[PDB]
Each structure stands twice: as C-alpha cells, then as structure tokens.
Design a protein around this ligand. Structure first.
Ligand SMILES: Nc1ncnc2c1ncn2[C@@H]1O[C@H](COP(=O)(O)OP(=O)(O)OP(=O)(O)O)[C@@H](O)[C@H]1O
Ligand SMILES: Nc1ncnc2c1ncn2[C@@H]1O[C@H](COP(=O)(O)OP(=O)(O)OP(=O)(O)O)[C@@H](O)[C@H]1O
Ligand SMILES: [Mg+2]
Ligand SMILES: [Mg+2]
Lengths: 264, 264
C-alpha cells in the first residue's frame, strides 16, 4: 500500500546490488523516512554490511516465507533509527525447493515475498529489496513483489547481453504476474569514466535506454556511483558510508540517488 | 588421456570465475593439452567470451544433463584447436527443477554432470567447469563432478564470510557425493595489492587458509591475477587474453596458473 517497494536487481554477479540497496536504504533513512531493507540473498551481504553477524541471526526472511514466523518477529533495528532490516541467512537457500513444491500445488510461488510483505506495507515509506545474482525463484519473487526496479549496471562487457535479458524478464512479468511493475532507473556503479570499455558499453546502453538512466534532480546530470576505495571499505565497518564519511564521493552519489527517488 | 576435471567455483558474483575458467583453459591449450571448457552458467558468459552468440547456440549442456543429447553432440570447436567448448544457454535455468524432482523421487541429482562427462574423460587432458554464482544444484553438480576446485577470490570484505561457507559445502560433498574432491587452490583475482582493504582481507585469509593458496613452485610466490584493463576488454573481442594481449600482466598471471596446474 503506502510503501513503495523497490527491487534492486541484476542477474550479473558483483555489479553493486548490495552496495546500492544498503546505501540507498541508508540515504533515504537519514531523511527520517521509514525504511525497511529486505536482504533477499542467501549470502546475506546486506545483513553483514549493516554489522550483523551471520552466526548472530536467529530467524530470517526464509522463516517468514515458510510461515514459521510473522515478518514483525524477524525485523531488526539498525544503527539508524529509521532504517530497519529483515536479515538473511544460509537457510534462504532452501527457498528454491520450497518454491518448486509451491508450484506443484495450487500455490503461486512467485508471490511468496509479496504475500510476506503484506503486513508491513502500511508501516514503511520505502521497502528496498536486495536481490541475488540470477533470474531464479528469488529474483522472480523480488520483482513480483516490487512496485519498481533499480538496475545497477557495471559498465563491462557482459552488461550488454545481460541488461537485455533482465529487461525481457521484467516485461514477461509485466504481462503476467505484476502489470504495475516499472523501471525506476538504470544506475551505473563502480564507475570509471575514462576507460574505453566503459565508454563503449555506456554509449551502447544510451542508444537504447537514455530515458531510463537516473538523473540528478537539481542539476540534470546523470547519477553514477563512482568506483570508490571508501565505498568498498564501508561494509568492513558494518556501517553505511553516510554514517562516518558523508562527504565522500560514494556517499554523495548515493544521496543524489535518494533525492531523485524522494521526488518520485 | 584421463581428464583432470576442475571446477571453478565461488558463490559470490563477479569474482572472476568465468575469466579464470576461460583463461586457464586457453593457457593449458597452448601446451598442446586437449581442453574441454564446460559453461555451467545459464547466463553463458564463458560461451560469449569465446565469440559465440547465445541466440545462436542450438543444443547446450542443459540438454546433455537431462539426457536429450550426448555431450559429444554439443561440443563446439573454438578458435584454438586444443580448446573445445560445451556451451550454455538460458534453458540451463530449468535444471534446478529437474534436480529437485530427482531429489524428491530417489534423492539423486548431484551426479548428473558427472554422469554426462563419463564419455569424454578419455578424450581430454583437462575438463574445466565454469560455475554460476550460488550454492545451488548447478554448483553442487560442478563440485560433485570434479577432481579439484579452483576458488577465485576478489579480496574485498564479503570474501571472508563467503570463503568459509564455500569450504563447508566442499566438506559436505567430500562426505557425500564426491570423496576425492580436493581444493586445487585459492586464486586472488582483480588484485590491487596496495589497497588497505586488500591487505586486511588477504591477511585474514592467510591466517586461516595459507596452505590453500596457489603457488609458483619456481619462486614460492603466491599466484594472483592482477586487475587489468586488457583482461576486462578481451571477452568483448571474443578472445582469451593470451590471444588479445599475450604480454599483458593478466595473460602472464594466467600462464603462471597453468604452469602450477601442469606441474601437478
Ligand atoms: N562503487 C563501488 N566502488 C568500489 N567498490 C564497490 C563499489 N560498489 C561495490 N563495491 C564492492 O564491489 C563488490 C561487489 O559489490 P556488491 O557485493 O555490492 O555487488 P552484488 O551485485 O551485490 O554482488 P552479488 O551478485 O554477489 O550479490 C563488493 O565488495 C563491494 O564492496
Ligand atoms: N583480473 C581482472 N581485471 C580486470 N577485470 C576483470 C578481472 N577479472 C574479471 N574481470 C572482469 O570483472 C567482471 C566479473 O568477472 P567474471 O564475469 O569473470 O566473474 P564471475 O565470477 O564469473 O561472475 P558471475 O558470478 O556473474 O558468473 C567481468 O566483467 C570481467 O571481465
Ligand atoms: Mg549482493
Ligand atoms: Mg561467470
């Protein structure tokens, strides 16, 4: 209902999905908009990014999906008063099995996350979903639950084929399980402007998808997350970058992203 | 000939599994060892890396796993006479369902790739398997088919939690479906030595797993693949780095890796 649910998705591995989900969630939360981050990857990197140890997590999103727990029972408060987390753990890897079992019986396996979110949509301004690297049941559940999708894009070769495919999947879902699903935007990540490869991949993407790239709401510039040493360091301190170095380039870029989201 | 089957595996996305599988395969082939590269990711990045279009592949590894085709029917010659490829395609994403069906009926499924490889173990010196980013059915099959596993590691924060988890899976399989399974080695990838994060992560990894790291036997040095612009460029040209810039640091490093493999 009230919450805009935003999936951060891209089947390619290591393109900044988690970094984006975490830092966007934080960058929205610092405005005292109430944010819920869903770690929807069994590797649980978002969870770890916010300083939570895998060995310290009790019940997680998986338990909610299978009905062992209500989502209110697993929600954790973070260092930021307006950022809450539904953590992940290894047991989310069991989801696939569950999914297929669901499909065999009268159930809509693609909607399990959507259903799980039902009881908190009226309680948050934004729900941000960190998706895993594939187009399987988990990512399908993420996209099926979302109002909109942010696609982080690393400008290297595999990005070209990959983006097209993700778009295909999205359109599939638009014609089936989630008609209202929109692209919130493409977000270049780990961006190194002067590389020939970067320029080539970007130019190719602009040709088809110019209108999909995030724009700075004050200046009209394209929003891109620069490759940043500090950004890589941040999960090692268990904090979003804005909590300790708010003037760093990565922090600044993610805050521009949040402003863009807050406007609509 | 009796193939050594080597899985390139790591559930983390974008850590150089594909770059490593492709370039190790090429680096072995130039020594007139007959290599079979198995693309075991539905995204088919290895396939694309060798100049094959996804939309142009007829039958792939998927069809072999489910018994529709014998593996000899899907093998493609590449630009290099000693390097053959079993290509992948999106339909490989259907394997999961099959796997779970199998687990449900007789608790089998882990050995489907192994079984598929039986008829070519006498025809190649090495079979290199490019694994997808997760610890699901595909990675389980890759590891269950292998003599040994190469674990590429990007030395950033998530490497710590991840590596331990991968070891757990390996141990599990060592206790179940694949007793002979060994770690061939850990391989730092996209390596930038002077970064504080890299130093910290490497120190922790040496602390627990020093003995697992790949070594150059001539110097005792740790083998690491340097971050390389040319390495990132090469798949865009459909070539292994040794065909694209044989004198580049990435090419040199992968040839060292091949030496480490060839020496035993
Ligand atoms: N803008 C950036 N600058 C420098 N390093 C970054 C940046 N963004 C992400 N990283 C680092 O690159 C690595 C990969 O990022 P990340 O884990 O967020 O991607 P991912 O898409 O979630 O990966 P996966 O597919 O495995 O889920 C991480 O170690 C992360 O810390
Ligand atoms: N040593 C390197 N230097 C520079 N770029 C690299 C290096 N190794 C890999 N890359 C690039 O980083 C990206 C990720 O590498 P790669 O696709 O091989 O990882 P992966 O583990 O196979 O990811 P996935 O889990 O999605 O299959 C690729 O764009 C690749 O070209
Ligand atoms: Mg992630
Ligand atoms: Mg790959």
């Amino acid at each position: 209902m009230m919450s805009e649910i935003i999936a951060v998705a891209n089947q390619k591995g290591g393109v900044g999905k988690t970094t984006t989900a975490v830092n966007l969630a934080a960058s929205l939360a610092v405005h005292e908009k109430k944010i819920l981050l869903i770690d929807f990857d069994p590797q649980a990197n978002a969870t770890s990014s916010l300083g939570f140890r895998r060995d310290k997590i009790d019940y997680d999103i998986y338990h909610v999906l299978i009905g062992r727990k209500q989502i209110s029972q697993v929600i954790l408060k973070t260092q930021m008063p307006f950022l809450d987390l539904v953590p992940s753990n290894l047991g989310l890897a069991g989801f696939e099995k569950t999914f297929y079992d669901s499909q065999d019986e009268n159930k809509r396996g693609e909607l399990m996350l959507k259903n799980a979110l039902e009881s908190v949509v009226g309680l948050y301004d934004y729900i941000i979903i960190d998706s895993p690297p594939a187009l399987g049941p988990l990512t399908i559940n993420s996209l099926s639950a979302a109002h909109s999708v942010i696609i982080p894009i690393q400008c290297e070769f595999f990005a070209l084929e990959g983006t097209k495919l993700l778009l295909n999947t999205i359109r599939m879902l638009q014609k089936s399980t989630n008609p209202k699903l929109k692209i919130r935007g493409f977000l270049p990540t780990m961006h190194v402007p002067q590389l020939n490869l970067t320029k080539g991949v970007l130019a190719e993407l602009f040709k088809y998808f110019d209108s999909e790239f995030f724009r700075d709401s004050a200046t009209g510039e394209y929003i891109m997350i620069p490759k940043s040493v500090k950004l890589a360091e941040s999960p090692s301190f268990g904090k979003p970058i804005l909590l300790y170095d708010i003037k760093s380039n990565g922090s600044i870029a993610y805050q521009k992203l949040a402003q863009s989201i807050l406007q609509g």
